[PDB]
Symmetry: C2
Subunit: 90 residues, 2 copies
């Protein structure tokens, strides 16, 4: 029974982790895209336009790097769940 | 046993989650500081559509980071309890 309760709980937490990243990724991409707009609205003030670019690039870097980190943790978490699943239904 | 390796593996995953939450928090807070930097300078210099847009972005970012701290707190606590239960069951 306990093992099943661990599987169930962890299963929810894993799902919650992946849904929150789906959400955050969207939120930060829109954020990125609005910086990107702003760069064009400016260019259409030399310190400023350059700062917007940098920020756009920082955030892009972060999203790419987090995406890779999330991919890797999700895979490890799914393998763990599989093992748990097998153990409870054994 | 294989529950002991389950525990070991989940421990490292949660440790890496915690470590990446701290780094993520620092990166985006530094980003917010830089964005704030930009807003006030643009607002000094000042057509005005650009100010409103930047100021909106800053408030959206700040909102996000507050919510993120809350969600992380809850998630961290969920994972600690589960690990404890796992740890106990391994003994």
């Amino acid at each position: 029974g306990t093992l099943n309760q661990l599987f169930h709980n962890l299963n929810e937490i894993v799902e919650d982790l992946n849904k929150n990243w789906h959400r955050e990724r969207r939120t930060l991409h829109d954020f990125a895209d609005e910086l990107h707009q702003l760069v064009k609205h400016v260019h259409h003030l030399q310190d400023i336009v350059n700062q917007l670019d940098k920020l756009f690039r920082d955030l892009d870097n972060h999203l790419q790097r987090k995406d890779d980190t999330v991919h890797h943790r999700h895979h490890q978490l799914n393998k763990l769940l599989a093992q748990l699943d097998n153990l409870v239904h054994r």
